[PDB]
Design a protein around this ligand. Sequence first.
Ligand SMILES: *[C@@H]1O[C@H](CO)[C@@H](O)[C@H](O)[C@H]1NC(C)=O
Lengths: 101, 51
Amino acid sequence: QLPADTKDAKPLLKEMKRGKEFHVIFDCSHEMAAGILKQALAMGMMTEYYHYIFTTLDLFALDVEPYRYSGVNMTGFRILNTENTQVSSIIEKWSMERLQA
Amino acid sequence: QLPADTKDAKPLLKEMKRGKEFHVIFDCSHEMAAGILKQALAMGMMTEYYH
Ligand SMILES: *[C@@H]1O[C@H](CO)[C@@H](O)[C@H](O)[C@H]1NC(C)=O
């Protein structure tokens, strides 16, 4: 169980590294998934050995640029049917007004 | 040999990782050491193996 604060996730990661646990099913809102993945990266917990699975339904929204060359596997799930072009147009129109925030 | 530009470092590091070479003596001004270290981190070559 990840503790109350996120950035205190380091002890868990140390324990997992010592125990040689090479498969994980994270479970949290993608916002906290990003933090735990960054903590993993700075822990050297990110190579072609480990393989993460994210029960979050927004794994696609993460920034993946710093991670994709590492050779790590991150299988997620995505319900938002973005293959249809109509959906893509709607999403783009939505982004056209999200950037006020 | 490192290539001319900094971020060209990646193809070199790919072959390093493929050949299973965990002992490296770098030789460059630290201004390049920082860049090559970031590349090595994004390439995921920063574990307890490499020295
Ligand atoms: C991890 O990803 C790489 C590239 O897709 C793949 O070749 C490998 O089979 C995957 N599994 C492991 C070893 O984690």
